[PDB]
Amino acid sequence: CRPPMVKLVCPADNLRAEGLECTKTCQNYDLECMSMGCVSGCLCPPGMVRHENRCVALERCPCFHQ
Amino acid sequence: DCQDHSFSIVIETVQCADDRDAVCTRSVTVRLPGLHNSLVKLKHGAGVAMDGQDVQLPLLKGDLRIQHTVTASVRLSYGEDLQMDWDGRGRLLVKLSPVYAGKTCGLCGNYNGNQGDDFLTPSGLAEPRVEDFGNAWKL
Amino acid sequence: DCQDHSFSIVIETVQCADDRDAVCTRSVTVRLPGLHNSLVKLKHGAGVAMDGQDVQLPLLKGDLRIQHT
Amino acid sequence: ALASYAAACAGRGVRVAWREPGRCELNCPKGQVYLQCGTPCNLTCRSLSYPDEECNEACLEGCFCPPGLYMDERGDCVPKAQCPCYYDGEIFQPEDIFSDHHTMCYCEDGFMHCTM
Amino acid sequence: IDGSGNFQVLLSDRYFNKTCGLCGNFNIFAEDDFMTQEGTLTSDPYDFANSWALSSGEQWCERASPPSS
Ligand SMILES: *[C@@H]1O[C@H](CO)[C@@H](O)[C@H](O)[C@H]1NC(C)=O
Ligand SMILES: *[C@@H]1O[C@H](CO)[C@@H](O)[C@H](O)[C@H]1NC(C)=O
């Protein structure tokens, strides 16, 4: 859909796929993310997390105090 | 569980009563990795719906039991340790056995004896304010 | 259907009322290869159990509807 | 055995009473009416929340309610504008409001009136 | 309040863009003064104006509807 990472839409067997509904940011990375069902969209590759602008290397998102 | 990954409870809240401060809860969803991979939504009525299919109570399975109670509510159970109550209009109670005595990360806090570290974020430091506390457990 | 295999119906019959000739029917099972492989059992009460799990009516699926009348 | 014949007749258009005190009269529960054909496309508060699904039904000879009332979820037929609202899976209650992030919904009578 | 029962209020300058009630926000633009209590904007008069009702113990109020006459 948009470079520089690949896209997937849905396998749609009984909807386990992580679509646009569950985008691992650097705040949600560890949390038990929910999955209502696969939705065709766009996402960065698994070894990556989104920040405010785009997806930047995992080892550079800040850790948040107050 | 946060140590052995044996359950997880996730709640959904939406605002009621056309007012700034009144915020309710609609539904609770429970996940049990022991039962393959089961999602058991609890809905606004007395409804239960496991893996998308509305079901008729009582339910018996490998180690899970769901059943009505006398005062028109529900009662989910798991083996000798976990237990829940839920009646329609957003009032959930969750009892828990002393087996999980110190291993829990959630919005209820870990389960040792001290209430002085109950605002402990997933990073590791505890917050002074309640507002920044709950913005850390969003999904 | 026997020619395209679209559905199949089976009934189970037992004896009632402690007599030689009083025979009844208990349950009905319908198999629809269209819904993957679905087994819907119709029980002695009004209960319905799809693939072993009871359901609460009304049910809607691809083209399948079950409801109280 | 008698009712099977009467049902077979009705498929050919013939209507027949054949029921009197002293035979199997339906013993309808209280608060309901045994009355003959009542063309059921309503009498359930579900039909109020979903008004555009279907109405093509024949005569049935069931238990029904007086023509100002509807049946409740648990089985009573007292309500008029006291019967709940159905929504996406759940069940709500008269005079309720909620607002998540996209829509604002209340429910008057038996329908929603979601906006946004 | 007149003899007829007509109400009137006259606010001051230091409340520009700060009033919030049923006579609407106080701003120069006359198109965005149906903002509900939740902060969103609507078009329906009664949906906008039922969000500003106040209840007090004994007196409970329902949702108001436009007259059908
Ligand atoms: C239900 O549908 C029938 C069919 O036209 C209609 O005559 C009746 O007024 C409706 N309402 C009730 C309460 O029966
Ligand atoms: C009114 O106040 C809000 C919030 O400070 C601001 O965004 C908006 O521009 C103000 N309107 C005017 C006309 O100044």
Ligand SMILES: [Ca+2]
């Ligand atoms: Ca503690």
Ligand SMILES: [Ca+2]
């Ligand atoms: Ca204005």
